[PDB]
């Protein structure tokens, strides 16, 4: 569960907003144009993901 | 900044009543468009004086 | 330069005597003090152009 009293847990509250704000900006490219759908950039956009997921398990949400 | 947006939005539609009937309303819906810039392009050239002043 | 100095001086003491004793004499010593400077202390920052254009 989500916790907010010590400095344990506010670096992982912190390190999941910055692992979720790298992630938010690619989902826009990925639906708002054809501009940047490469077969490259989707890799990135991968990876960004799957940090996330090991963020969110990190934090305990 | 480093980024711009745009607005996106739909559009509606034409109907049509007799005496005595109400009207109807619509909902429209909106998006947006981001764009941003990363690189440089460039060119250089380098000289040296002495062949400068020759 | 990079250097200052001071002068540090001695007292006297004083003694007694009787008919026919002769008169002590003392020597008063000296010293020096001396600074120097050596260190610089310093505060820096860089940024890149393009940052600042945007």
Redesign the interface.
Same mark, same amino acid.
């Given at each position: 569960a989500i916790t907010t009293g010590t400095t344990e847990a506010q670096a992982l509250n912190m390190t999941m907003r910055d692992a979720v704000l790298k992630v938010a900006?690619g989902v =826009? =490219?990925l639906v =708002?144009?054809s501009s940047q759908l490469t077969a490259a950039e989707i890799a990135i956009i991968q990876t960004n993901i799957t940090a996330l997921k090991a963020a969110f398990t990190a934090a305990g949400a | 900044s480093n980024q711009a947006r745009i607005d996106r939005m739909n559009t509606v539609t034409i109907k049509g009543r007799t005496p005595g009937q109400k009207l109807d309303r619509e909902s429209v819906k909106n998006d947006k468009l981001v764009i941003t810039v990363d690189t440089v392009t460039y060119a250089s050239t380098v000289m040296d004086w002495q062949d400068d002043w020759t």
């Amino acid at each position: 569960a989500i916790t907010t009293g010590t400095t344990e847990a506010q670096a992982l509250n912190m390190t999941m907003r910055d692992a979720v704000l790298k992630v938010a900006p690619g989902v =826009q =490219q990925l639906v =708002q144009n054809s501009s940047q759908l490469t077969a490259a950039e989707i890799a990135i956009i991968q990876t960004n993901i799957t940090a996330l997921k090991a963020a969110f398990t990190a934090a305990g949400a | 900044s480093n980024q711009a947006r745009i607005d996106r939005m739909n559009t509606v539609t034409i109907k049509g009543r007799t005496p005595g009937q109400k009207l109807d309303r619509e909902s429209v819906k909106n998006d947006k468009l981001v764009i941003t810039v990363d690189t440089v392009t460039y060119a250089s050239t380098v000289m040296d004086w002495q062949d400068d002043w020759t």
